[PDB]
Structure formats: structure tokens, C-alpha cells
Amino acid sequence: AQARKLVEQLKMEANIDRIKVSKAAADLMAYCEAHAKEDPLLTPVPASENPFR
Amino acid sequence: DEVWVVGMGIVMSLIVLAIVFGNVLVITAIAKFERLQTVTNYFITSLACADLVMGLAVVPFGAAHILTKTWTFGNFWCEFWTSIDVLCVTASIETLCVIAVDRYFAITSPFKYQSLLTKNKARVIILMVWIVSGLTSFLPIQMHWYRATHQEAINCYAEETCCDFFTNQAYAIASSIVSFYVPLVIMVFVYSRVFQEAKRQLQKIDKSEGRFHEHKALKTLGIIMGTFTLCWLPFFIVNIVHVIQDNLIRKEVYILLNWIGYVNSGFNPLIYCRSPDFRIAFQELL
Amino acid sequence: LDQLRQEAEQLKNQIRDARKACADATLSQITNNIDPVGRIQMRTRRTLRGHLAKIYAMHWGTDSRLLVSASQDGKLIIWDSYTTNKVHAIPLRSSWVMTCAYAPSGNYVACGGLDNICSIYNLKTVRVSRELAGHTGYLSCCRFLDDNQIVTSSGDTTCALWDIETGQQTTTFTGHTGDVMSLSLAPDTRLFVSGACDASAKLWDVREGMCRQTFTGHESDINAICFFPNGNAFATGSDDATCRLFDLRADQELMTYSHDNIICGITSVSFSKSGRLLLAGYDDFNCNVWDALKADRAGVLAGHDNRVSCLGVTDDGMAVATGSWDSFLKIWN
Amino acid sequence: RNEEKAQREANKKIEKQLQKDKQVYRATHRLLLLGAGESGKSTIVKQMRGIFETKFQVDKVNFHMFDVGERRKWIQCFNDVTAIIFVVASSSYNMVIREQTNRLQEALNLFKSIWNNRWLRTISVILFLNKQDLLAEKVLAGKSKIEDYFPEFARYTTPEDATPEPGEDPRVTRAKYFIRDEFLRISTASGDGRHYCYPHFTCAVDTENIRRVFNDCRDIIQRMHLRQYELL
Numbered sequence: 001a002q003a004r005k006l007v008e009q010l011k012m013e014a015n016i017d018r019i020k021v022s023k024a025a026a027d028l029m030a031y032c033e034a035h036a037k038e039d040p041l042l043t044p045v046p047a048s049e050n051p052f053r
Numbered sequence: 054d055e056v057w058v059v060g061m062g063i064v065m066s067l068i069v070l071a072i073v074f075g076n077v078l079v080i081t082a083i084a085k086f087e088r089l090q091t092v093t094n095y096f097i098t099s100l101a102c103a104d105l106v107m108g109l110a111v112v113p114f115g116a117a118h119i120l121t122k123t124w125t126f127g128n129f130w131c132e133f134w135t136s137i138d139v140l141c142v143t144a145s146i147e148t149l150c151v152i153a154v155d156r157y158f159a160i161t162s163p164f165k166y167q168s169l170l171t172k173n174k175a176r177v178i179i180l181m182v183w184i185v186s187g188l189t190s191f192l193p194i195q196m197h198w199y200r201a202t203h204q205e206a207i208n209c210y211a212e213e214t215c216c217d218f219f220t221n222q223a224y225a226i227a228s229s230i231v232s233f234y235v236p237l238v239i240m241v242f243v244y245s246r247v248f249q250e251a252k253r254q255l256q257k258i259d260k261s262e263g264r265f266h267e268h269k270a271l272k273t274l275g276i277i278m279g280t281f282t283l284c285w286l287p288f289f290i291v292n293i294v295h296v297i298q299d300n301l302i303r304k305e306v307y308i309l310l311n312w313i314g315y316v317n318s319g320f321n322p323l324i325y326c327r328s329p330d331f332r333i334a335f336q337e338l339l
Numbered sequence: 340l341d342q343l344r345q346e347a348e349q350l351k352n353q354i355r356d357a358r359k360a361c362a363d364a365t366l367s368q369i370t371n372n373i374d375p376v377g378r379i380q381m382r383t384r385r386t387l388r389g390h391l392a393k394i395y396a397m398h399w400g401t402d403s404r405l406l407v408s409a410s411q412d413g414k415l416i417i418w419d420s421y422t423t424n425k426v427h428a429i430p431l432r433s434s435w436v437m438t439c440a441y442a443p444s445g446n447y448v449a450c451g452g453l454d455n456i457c458s459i460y461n462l463k464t465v466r467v468s469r470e471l472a473g474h475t476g477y478l479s480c481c482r483f484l485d486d487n488q489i490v491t492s493s494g495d496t497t498c499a500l501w502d503i504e505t506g507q508q509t510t511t512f513t514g515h516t517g518d519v520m521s522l523s524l525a526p527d528t529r530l531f532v533s534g535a536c537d538a539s540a541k542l543w544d545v546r547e548g549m550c551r552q553t554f555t556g557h558e559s560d561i562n563a564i565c566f567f568p569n570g571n572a573f574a575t576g577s578d579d580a581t582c583r584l585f586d587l588r589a590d591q592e593l594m595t596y597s598h599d600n601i602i603c604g605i606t607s608v609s610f611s612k613s614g615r616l617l618l619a620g621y622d623d624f625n626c627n628v629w630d631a632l633k634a635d636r637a638g639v640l641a642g643h644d645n646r647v648s649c650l651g652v653t654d655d656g657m658a659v660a661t662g663s664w665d666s667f668l669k670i671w672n
Numbered sequence: 673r674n675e676e677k678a679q680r681e682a683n684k685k686i687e688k689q690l691q692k693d694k695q696v697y698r699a700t701h702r703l704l705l706l707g708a709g710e711s712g713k714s715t716i717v718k719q720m721r722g723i724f725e726t727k728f729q730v731d732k733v734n735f736h737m738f739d740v741g742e743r744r745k746w747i748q749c750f751n752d753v754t755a756i757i758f759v760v761a762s763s764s765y766n767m768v769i770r771e772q773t774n775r776l777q778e779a780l781n782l783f784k785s786i787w788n789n790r791w792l793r794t795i796s797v798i799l800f801l802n803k804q805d806l807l808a809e810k811v812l813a814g815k816s817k818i819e820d821y822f823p824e825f826a827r828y829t830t831p832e833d834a835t836p837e838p839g840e841d842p843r844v845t846r847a848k849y850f851i852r853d854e855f856l857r858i859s860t861a862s863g864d865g866r867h868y869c870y871p872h873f874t875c876a877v878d879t880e881n882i883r884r885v886f887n888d889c890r891d892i893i894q895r896m897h898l899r900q901y902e903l904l
């Protein structure tokens with residue numbers, strides 16, 4: 001029934017391993033710091049480089 | 054009485070500043086924000102432009118003439134100033150007439166008003182109402198048709214000092230009618246119809262949900278027509294009167310009523326541009 | 340019957356305990372020493388006019404120039420942002436629409452709405468390529484996995500993977516309690532997440548067709564979904580005036596974006612390139628730009644007459660444009 | 673090169689088409705049919721005649737109606753409609769919805785939710801009381817007391833200003849006026865005059881409901897225009 005389809009789903013969803021939140025936060029910070037050089041919204045763009053202006 | 058002259062100049066400058074400030078505020082509110090761009094708001098923009106050009110052109114020159122008791126500029130510039138004055142007054146009053154007609158069609162024909170009025174139609178009617186105003190003002194003044202046969206008037210028309218208005222039966226009557234009397238009757242008829250519709254709607258509401266928990270309409274109509282009739286009716290009445298009878302009235306009262314008609318333009322932005330959207334835009338600009 | 344209910348509660352308690360144990364230190368502590376991005380000022384470079392009614396959804400093309408916007412007037416308009424001119428105009432059989440998408444190949448345009456059918460239009464040929472049917476509710480959002488298969492977020496609480504050529508649902512994902520209101524695709528086609536009108540937001544795997552993780556941080560409904568650019572995180576929008584970020588590997592929420600000045604919901608959320616600025620379109624008349632790591636309102640986008648209902652950043656991250664309930668689009672930079 | 677000219681020509685053609693579409697779209701008025709499934713919305717829709725659309729025109733005015741078919745978040749789509757048509761089974765006081773509450777009470781709850789919705793603040797709702805003959809039969813004959821099902825009926829009295837229909841019994845008039853007054857009290861409690869409610873007593877036999885819809889749409893537009901200019 002519906003109860004089995006949910007109990008089995010919860011059983012199969014809690015078995016996955018979890019990485020520490022510190023590692024995930026460090027990964028996000030590293031990605032942002034590495035790719036911030038290529039962000040055109042974050043940093044002002046030159047008039048020649050800016051296509052909209 | 055130099056104190057009286059100083060006070061008159063001060064109040065004239067105050068009126069000039071108030072008219073210019075209010076009109077530029079309204080026009081920049083219309084221009085800057087695309088939300089206010091509405092088919093009915095084009096008429097408001099036209100009225101604001103007419104009042105603004107009047108306040109920038111004829112109010113300062115008229116005040117200078119009143120204070121200095123003479124016309125310092127050239128003879129042709131006097132005719133140009135008179136033409137600008139007539140054009141501005143006629144355009145403003147006809148713009149109020151157009152706004153009243155647009156409102157009438159908005160209430161009396163709720164379904165057809167959506168398609169009857171369009172942006173292109175609004176532009177065409179604004180251009181037409183500006184063109185008809187110019188024909189009654191620039192064409193007679195520039196082609197010397199309003200020129201009278203009075204001895205002293207024709208004597209001073211050559212003189213550089215005389216810039217006072219002088220006209221015969223024909224131009225005075227025609228200009229007064231076209232500028233004020235037709236708009237007056239059109240606006241009073243359409244506002245009577247709108248008031249009848251509002252009263253019918255209020256009666257329907259009372260019959261519908263009156264058991265559970267027309268002052269506003271009367272107050273709004275008084276604020277709309279009152280500020281216009283009280284400011285322009287005396288001037289045109291005395292216009293027709295003194296043209297009919299030479300010694301009926303003096304010139305000082307005529308100038309005073311004309312200046313009341315001038316200062317009427319200050320109340321128009323407050324009388325019409327009072328929507329909550331207008332107030333929000335003004336607060337944003339401030 | 341009731342015996343199995345206790346097992347589900349025990350499993351939920353165990354999952355919550357494991358998630359709590361995983362949270363050694365919040366993201367705010369780790370990012371404390373990093374420098375703020377400062378105030379970000381943006382201006383409306385180009386305003387796209389031509390729409391007849393309110394716009395709900397928009398999707399940038401594979402390139403950074405082409406757009407597509409859906410409105411209740413019954414017309415999809417494809418714009419050219421570089422010159423602010425319309426390219427194509429497509430009518431619809433149904434007046435009311437809720438979503439639109441642009442194929443990565445740049446040849447197909449998918450549109451949905453209250454009509455449960457999903458319409459795909461051939462830009463390169465504007466006839467209806469296929470009218471996908473089978474959902475029993477409105478289509479909140481549709482996306483292009485490729486030029487041959489799409490995924491939809493139906494109102495029947497079931498997101499289903501479609502096949503354009505076959506015209507039938509290849510796989511149907513079920514489990515959400517409420518109606519699904521948002522959907523986003525990961526940089527890879529393997530995974531995608533969908534936010535429903537219930538508190539929970541679920542992660543789905545296309546290869547297996549079974550949900551892998553479920554996040555229930557929010558208290559109100561979900562309205563916007565967007566992955567982090569790398570694909571290891573995603574942020575959600577809610578009607579409770581709170582935007583929250585979740586980490587897939589950590590399986591728990593990291594930070595929440597909220598302010599006492601805002602008591603209105605969020606209608607659209609997208610991530611800027613490099614994942615540093617979180618652009619969220621709020622239910623009020625303006626838009627607030629959030630710092631992804633510091634939860635600081637770096638910039639505010641204002642100038643929309645009505646509620647902002649769409650928001651999207653280009654693939655190359657060149658610019659962002661918002662689709663509001665006013666009939667005008669606005670491209671910011 | 674010629675790409676700019678081609679794009680300009682495409683823009684000109686699309687702009688002309690969109691101007692024509694805007695004219696025809698502003699020419700017509702939309703309507704939403706939101707009523708209970710047991711209230712006989714289908715028969716009323718047929719009487720005027722995923723989502724069902726109905727097009728009908730009166731006095732060269734094109735009315736366009738949509739019938740849908742839970743917490744509903746599709747309501748936010750209809751934030752700009754001329755009116756919302758609500759059909760309620762006036763005879764459903766006795767019947768209880770399957771799995772139990774009074775059907776009329778469920779309709780009242782739905783009306784309260786719709787009226788107080790944030791997105792529907794400015795939209796007036798047109799109220800249709802369907803199946804009046806069944807209500808008249810139930811009130812005139814049968815062992816069913818309105819007071820037992822609805823406690824407020826015992827204190828309620830027929831208003832003096834109320835005008836009963838020609839050749840109508842007093843008990844049925846009191847019952848129908850109480851049913852109408854429940855909705856009207858739900859409506860008039862909230863709102864600042866932006867949107868109103870227009871109750872109507874209709875039956876399947878009646879064939880003048882389209883004229884009523886036309887008149888009510890005209891009144892709604894007139895009220896909106898009057899309140900916009902601050903004369904109402």
C-alpha cells in the first residue's frame with residue numbers, strides 16, 4: 001500500500017553516507033574563490049567587454 | 054506706494070515659481086515612470102505642458118508689464134506674447150474639456166471605452182485640440198484680424214509702450230465662445246451625466262447591501278468644476294461685457310480677472326494629478 | 340497497519356539524528372573571515388516591451404543573447420537582447436500559461452500552462468512539434484535535458500520524464516505530498532531536483548527514477564529552485580520570505596537568507612555564475628540580491644511596476660533579466 | 673550587414689501583429705467560473721453557451737469564460753479578470769459532502785477563502801444560487817429545519833426592505849434570503865469598496881442569466897471606473 005511505498009523509501013534514503021559539513025563549506029568557498037575571476041556580475045565589466053552597453 | 058509694488062512683484066514671483074514647479078513635477082512624473090503612461094494620462098500631460106508654457110511665457114512678461122507700467126520689448130514681441138497667451142489659455146481649457154469627455158465616455162459606456170480610446174487615437178485628438186487652439190490665437194493676432202478701429206487703440210498700436218489688449222466685437226466674441234463657453238457647456242453636461250450615473254450606482258449599492266454595514270461625488274465635482282468656473286467665468290463674462298459696452302468696466306478689474314484666470318493653472322495639477330500613484334511618484338522624486 | 344507507521348517515524352528520527360551529527364559547524368562560521376563582496380549596483384540596460392499581459396516564466400538560450408518569455412496574452416516572444424528586438428512570435432491554443440523553456444540546441448521551445456498538455460515548437464523549420472499529454476494538472480515548469488527529451492513539473496505532484504519523438508512518459512517520479520511548483524536541471528543530465536508546494540524539496544535521479552534525498556527545512560511552500568553552478572548544492576524560494584541553501588553531499592541546509600524588512604514570498608531564484616551572488620525575485624515590487632556565503636543583501640534591483648515572477652542568469656553569466664507581472668521585461672547588468 | 677534590416681522587418685511585422693492582438697484582447701473581457709462540482713456548474717455553463725473554455729457575445733461585446741477541472745494556487749493566474757462567477761447549490765443545505773460537512777457550509781468557506789485571497793483583492797465576484805426550485809421544495813415540504821443545521825436561522829428574520837418574488841411562499845422567501853444574507857455578510861465584512869458581490873437566484877429553467885452576467889459586468893466596470901476617479 002502507500003505505507004510500504006513510503007517506509008521502504010525512507011529506509012533506502014537514510015543509508016547513504018554523509019560528508020562533514022566543514023568539507024562541503026570548504027568546497028563551496030574554494031569553488032567561489034576560484035571562479036570569481038570569471039564572474040561578470042560580481043565585478044564591474046569594461047565598456048568594450050560589456051556587450052549590452 | 055513702493056511697498057505695494059514690491060508686494061505685487063513678490064506675489065507674482067511666488068505664483069510663477071509655484072506654477073513652474075508643479076507643472077514640471079507633473080510632467081517629469083509622467084515622463085520618468087512608464088507606469089503612468091496611460092491613454093487618459095496623455096491628456097494630463099498635454100494640460101501640464103500648456104499650463105507650463107503659459108506660466109513660463111506670459112505670467113513673467115505680464116508681471117513685468119504690470120510692475121513697469123510699460124512694454125520694454127518690441128512691438129512684434131507684444132503681438133507674439135498676446136498670441137502665446139491666447140493659445141495657452143484656449144489649449145488648457147479645451148484640454149480640461151477633453152479630459153471631462155474622456156471620463157464621461159469611461160463611465161457612461163463601460164464596455165466600448167476599452168476599444169474606443171487608443172494611444173494613437175489619444176495622440177491624434179491631442180494634436181487636433183492643440184491645432185484648433187492655435188488657429189483661434191495665432192491666425193487672427195498675426196494676420197491683424199483682431200485689430201480694432203478705436204481711435205486711442207490704433208493710436209497706441211504704433212507706440213512701443215502700448216501693449217494693452219484691444220479688440221472688436223467679432224474676435225472677442227468668437228475667441229471667448231470657442232475658448233470657454235463651448236468647453237463649459239460640454240463639461241457641465243458630461244459631468245451632470247456622470248453624476249447621474251454615480252447616483253444610480255449608489256442607489257443600486259444601497260438596495261443591494263445597504264442593510265449591512267453622495268458626499269464624495271459632490272465634493273469631487275465641486276473641486277473639479279469649482280476651481281475652474283470660479284477662476285475663468287468672471288473673466289470671460291467681463292470680457293463680453295466690456296466689449297459690448299465700452300464704459301461698462303475699468304481696465305484694472307479686467308487685468309485682475311485675467312490674472313485670476315492665469316493663476317488657475319496652479320490648481321490644475323492638484324485638482325487632477327492627485328491619484329495615489331501620483332502621490333507615490335512624487336514621494337519617490339522627493 | 341499502524342505498526343509500519345512507527346517504523347517510518349523511527350527512520351525519520353534516525354535520519355534527523357544523523358543529519359544533526361553531520362553538522363559539525365555551520366557555513367556561517369567558516370565563511371566569517373572572507374571579505375564581503377560590497378555593494379552591487381545594477382541598472383536596467385534594456386527594457387523589452389511588446390508583451391500584452393503579465394509574464395510568468397522566462398529562459399535564456401544556450402547562448403547569452405536569445406530569450407523566450409510566456410505571458411497570459413497567449414503569445415511566446417523570442418527576443419534578441421543584444422539589439423532589443425523581437426525575432427519570433429508564437430500564438431497558443433490555451434490563453435493561460437505557466438512556464439517556458441529553451442532547448443540547448445537552440446531549435447525547440449517548450450511551453451506549458453493550465454492546459455495539462457505540453458507544447459513544443461520548432462523554432463528552426465513555428466508549428467506545434469508535439470503536444471505531450473498525460474499529466475492531470477497544470478505544468479509549473481519544464482526543462483530541456485536534450486533536444487529529444489524533456490522533464491515537467493506537473494500539478495499532480497508527479498514530475499515525469501517525457502520523450503519528444505515517442506510522445507509518451509518514459510518515467511514518472513512520484514512521492515511529493517503537494518503540487519510541484521519548481522524544477523531545475525543539474526549541469527549534468529543525470530540528476531535534477533524539484534520543489535513542491537509542501538515544505539519538502541526532493542532530489543530525483545533520472546537514471547534510476549527514484550528519489551535519493553529529501554530536504555524539509557522550509558515551513559511554507561516552495562516556489563523557486565536553482566542548482567549551484569558546480570552542481571553540489573541548490574537554493575530554494577518560499578512564500579515565508581525565507582531563501583535557504585542546501586548541500587547534496589551534506590544532506591542538510593547550510594544557511595538561510597532572511598530579513599525583518601521582508602514579509603513577502605519569493606517567486607524566482609537563480610544563481611549567478613561562480614555561485615557568489617544569489618539573485619532572488621521577491622513577491623514585493625523589487626528584487627534583492629543576496630550574497631551566497633555571507634547572507635548579506637549586497638544589492639537591490641528595483642523598477643518593476645508589479646510583482647516579479649521570473650528571473651534568470653545567462654549561461655556565460657553575462658547578464659540577468661527579470662520577468663515581472665508588469666508587461667515589461669528588464670535586463671540588468 | 674543585411675541581418676539588421678531583416679531583423680527590423682521582422683520586428684515591424686511582429687509589432688503590427690501584436691498591435692492587432694492587443695486591440696482584440698482589450699476588446700474582450702474574461703470570466704472565471706469557480707463553483708462546486710455538485711452545484712451544477714456544467715448545466716449553467718451550457719445554459720450560457722484540462723480546462724474548458726466558453727465564448728459567448730452579448731450586444732457586440734465578447735465575453736470569454738473558463739471552467740477549471742484542493743488548495744489552489746492556479747488562482748494567482750486569474751488576478752486580472754472582469755469578474756468571477758460563483759455557483760452555489762442553494763438546496764445543498766441538507767446534503768453533506770462525501771467523506772461529513774454541510775455542502776453550503778463548504779461553499780461559504782470557499783467563498784471566504786476566495787474573497788480574502790491577496791491576489792483576488794480587486795476582483796468582484798458574481799454569485800449564482802443554483803437549483804432554487806429544489807430549495808423551495810425542501811423548505812416548503814419535508815422534515816428538515818434550517819435552524820438545526822444552521823443555528824443562526826432561528827434568530828434571523830425576513831428583512832422589511834427585502835422584496836419577495838411574485839407568488840412566493842413566505843417560508844421559502846425567508847430561507848432564500850437567509851442563504852443570500854450569509855454570503856452577503858461574508859462579503860461586506862471585508863473589502864474597501866474595490867470589489868463587490870452580486871447574488872442572484874437562478875434555476876435551470878431560467879434562460880436570462882446571460883443578460884444578468886452582462887449587466888453585472890457593466891456595473892463592475894462602471895464601479896471600477898468611478899472609484900478610480902474618486903466619485904464613488
Ligand SMILES: CN[C@@H]1CCc2c(ccc(O)c2O)[C@H]1O
Nearest residue numbers: 135138139142143218228229232
Ligand atoms: C491679453 N489677455 C487675453 C485677451 C483675450 C483672451 C484671453 C484668453 C483667451 C481668449 O480666448 C481671449 O480672447 C486673455 O488671456
